[PDB]
Enzyme design. Structure first.
Site, mmCIF file in Angstrom:
data_model
loop_
_atom_site.group_PDB
_atom_site.id
_atom_site.type_symbol
_atom_site.label_atom_id
_atom_site.label_comp_id
_atom_site.label_asym_id
_atom_site.label_seq_id
_atom_site.Cartn_x
_atom_site.Cartn_y
_atom_site.Cartn_z
ATOM 1 N N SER A 120 42.209 10.207 0.689
ATOM 2 C CA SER A 120 42.802 9.095 1.432
ATOM 3 C C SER A 120 41.916 7.895 1.307
ATOM 4 C CB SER A 120 42.908 9.458 2.909
ATOM 5 O OG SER A 120 41.575 9.618 3.416
ATOM 6 N N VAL A 121 42.474 6.765 1.711
ATOM 7 C CA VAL A 121 41.752 5.493 1.657
ATOM 8 C C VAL A 121 40.422 5.583 2.425
ATOM 9 C CG1 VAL A 121 43.203 4.409 3.492
ATOM 10 C CG2 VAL A 121 41.937 2.964 1.800
ATOM 11 N N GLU A 122 40.401 6.212 3.597
ATOM 12 C CA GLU A 122 39.092 6.386 4.331
ATOM 13 C C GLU A 122 38.086 7.228 3.593
ATOM 14 O OE1 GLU A 122 37.058 5.634 7.335
ATOM 15 O OE2 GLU A 122 35.700 7.402 7.216
ATOM 16 N N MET A 123 38.539 8.296 2.989
ATOM 17 C CA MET A 123 37.663 9.177 2.257
ATOM 18 C C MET A 123 37.087 8.458 1.020
ATOM 19 S SD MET A 123 40.136 12.520 2.440
ATOM 20 C CE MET A 123 39.311 13.528 1.221
ATOM 21 N N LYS A 169 34.629 5.635 2.254
ATOM 22 C CA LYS A 169 33.435 6.047 2.989
ATOM 23 C C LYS A 169 33.151 7.523 2.683
ATOM 24 C CE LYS A 169 33.442 3.358 7.233
ATOM 25 N NZ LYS A 169 32.828 1.994 7.133
#
Ligand code: HEC
Ligand code: HEC
Ligand code: HEC
Ligand code: HEC
Ligand SMILES: [Ca+2]
Ligand SMILES: [Ca+2]
Lengths: 319, 320
Positions: free
Chosen positions: A112-115, A118
């Site tokens: 995902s975009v968060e993974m 970051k």
């Protein structure tokens, strides 16, 4: 018939056994770990969102919402494509510029975009959860530090390769059983083949094979067929993946924008001059009856028991 | 919509500036290093074969041979596709199983089977050539050990991004000058659009966008190439085939994944396949050819590099 014969060249049935992922061998511990990660909402900073939220194995592998932002390669909200049979997609992104799309495939799609933004937070979260490092050691033997962003995606990927949906009625038809689908289903298939739809929505996944310079947009000049149309202009920066139509009857809404809810309207919209296609409303109905035979056996997926936080686990980021 | 307007949705002209490669910024010294590596036959075990051998910038970026094996993802000999505009390809492999093809794109395609099999050897070769490490340091600043396999492919890649062929007559036509192609080439375009050719051969690269369950095979069922070969698609098919970019097609014979069909007019008639729902007459094929001849762009003027010399440590050529 010759309709069956033609169908047998254009498509292939989904194999029951999970496909082998090159350089990502499956083993029960790696599949088990990927399942945990897929359902683990602590992969999101809110601690609320897991892969299953947007790709819900109970709801055709999607979320029956119009759009979301799940991943770093999206330029905007897009409809969540099914994870079911997604390992059989060649084109894995909804849209992009041609010169970017192959590089983008350097993956991983399972972040995902968060993974992806970051990845240190992802690893720190997993290392702080005592039951994870041992699973990572078991799933990725012979590595000193197996808890990595790359191994998270590998474990998800092998779990994802089990989310295949063999045995749709159409697949029984492809295997030679003419009776597996109604004669109206079969007429729908004839139209699908004759009108040229199959060229774009072809192969084992009946789509997901390539990008085309047509996307469904709002018409700038009262009903979904009047409001949306296939568009292709001089100014287009981005081409569009033609999706797999397997399980299409259970993964509304449709198109990259999620804006068309009814499968019949989607089919009418695809009867587009821009595509060389004219279909009658009665044609559309037969094509829909055919598209309804692409629903495969849905995987029965055990919800994992996730390893508990430790006192060291980072806090949810709030509201 | 008239033919030009339809062409303008189906395709886009090749930009004049090298496309930007994500996470691989061009700079003059990284372009130059990639040029050196593309032409350096010491990347092959024989020390005779460079990328230019099979993708020869003087012959349309291909080698005008039927087949070779250059890369680790090939299961057999295939025709060498042009490097010209290959940076605009989305589908970069000739054929494969659907479930493998996306994974393969985690590439790099810039690595020959010898490079990909023996990456330490490639690094050892380059590090034994005293002029290469300083060039890698210039190309990849801020990196303590820049002579690496991944950097050889990034450097090649930004060099390859400069091998684009803007300004084909057809692109001048897409930009709005109806006279940039002949009236017969325009009819061949209309035929190309109307028969459905463009669905598969679309976009800025006029193909290279996707894979299809059709490949040209020897017919088992009368004789010329149109007699001998045909689009085939069976229940038994394990592999789908990439529909190729048609830019510069007039200069990159022979044709298809097997390189078995030498004449473009024959390749065109073969594509007028019932499998594809297409029926074209012989005069239809001639007009389409006339059109495809308009897809030849301005060929890059590429200086052959002066390659840094061997040291006494450089590995020795091997014949097999
Ligand atoms: C948790 C880590 C996961 C995993 C394993 C996947 N996702 Fe998503 N996803 C979302 C949207 C809108 C898209 C389409 C984006 C676009 O291309 O424009 C995707 C795409 C995918 C795919 C690709 C499937 C294919 O081959 O086409 C896959 C395999 C995938 N995802 C897996 C939406 C979301 C979310 C909404 C907020 C979240 C959360 C995730 N995805 C997370 C994950
Ligand atoms: C390529 C030239 C195509 C042809 C011919 C047809 N389709 Fe298509 N289809 C194509 C694309 C690129 C897309 C996505 C467009 C977008 O903006 O997202 C589609 C989409 C569909 C869908 C939606 C499926 C989903 O959202 O999961 C359906 C149901 C669909 N296409 C069906 C369909 C039929 C019946 C066709 C013949 C009448 C047809 N398609 C032609 C690419 C192309
Ligand atoms: C012949 C012996 C080759 C040498 C040496 C190199 N390449 Fe090659 N290349 C070759 C073939 C037969 C093919 C097609 C393989 C397949 O089945 O798909 C290729 C393919 C490429 C491509 C992909 C182009 C595209 O379609 O998008 C590229 C970019 C490419 N080759 C580049 C390349 C470079 C940079 C090389 C030197 C390191 C090189 N190739 C060597 C045949 C041969
Ligand atoms: C998709 C369903 C296609 C349609 C419609 C057309 N083409 Fe095609 N083309 C397609 C593929 C998958 C391939 C590769 C097949 C193989 O075994 O290699 C091709 C190949 C060509 C080529 C050869 C180009 C080269 O080797 O560089 C040409 C000249 C070509 N196709 C032209 C062409 C014409 C004129 C079409 C309409 C009549 C047409 N194609 C349709 C896939 C598809
Ligand atoms: Ca959907
Ligand atoms: Ca060729």
């Amino acid at each position: 018939e010759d309709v069956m014969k033609r169908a047998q060249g254009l498509f292939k049935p989904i194999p029951a056994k999970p496909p082998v992922m090159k350089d990502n061998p499956a083993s029960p511990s790696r599949v088990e770990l990927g399942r945990m990660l897929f359902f683990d909402p602590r992969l999101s900073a809110s601690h609320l969102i897991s892969c299953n939220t947007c790709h819900n194995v109970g709801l055709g592998g999607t979320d029956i919402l119009e759009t979301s932002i799940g991943h770093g390669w999206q330029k905007g909200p897009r409809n969540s494509p099914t994870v079911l049979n997604a390992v059989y997609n060649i084109a894995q992104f909804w849209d992009g510029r041609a010169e970017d799309l192959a590089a983008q495939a350097k993956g991983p799609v399972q972040a995902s975009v968060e993974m992806n933004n970051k990845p240190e937070n992802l690893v720190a979260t997993l290392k702080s959860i005592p039951g994870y490092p041992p699973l990572f050691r078991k799933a990725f033997p012979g590595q000193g530090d197996p808890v990595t962003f790359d191994n998270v995606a590998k474990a998800i990927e092998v779990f994802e390769a089990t989310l295949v949906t063999p045995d749709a009625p159409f697949d029984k038809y492809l295997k030679g059983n003419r009776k597996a689908i109604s004669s109206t289903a079969e007429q729908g298939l004839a139209l699908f083949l004759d009108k040229g739809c199959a060229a774009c929505h072809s192969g084992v996944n009946m789509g997901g094979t390539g990008y085309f310079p047509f996307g469904v947009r709002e018409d700038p000049g009262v009903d979904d067929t009047g409001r949306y149309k296939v568009t292709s202009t001089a100014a287009d920066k981005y081409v569009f993946r033609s999706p797999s139509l397997r399980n299409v009857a259970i993964t509304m809404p449709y198109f990259h924008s999620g804006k068309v809810w009814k499968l019949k309207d989607a089919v009418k919209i695809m009867g587009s001059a821009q595509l060389g296609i004219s279909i009658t409303d009665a044609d559309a109905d037969k094509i829909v009856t055919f598209l309804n035979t692409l629903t495969g056996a849905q995987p029965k997926v055990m919800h994992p028991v996730l390893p508990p936080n430790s006192d060291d686990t980072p806090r949810p980021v709030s509201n």
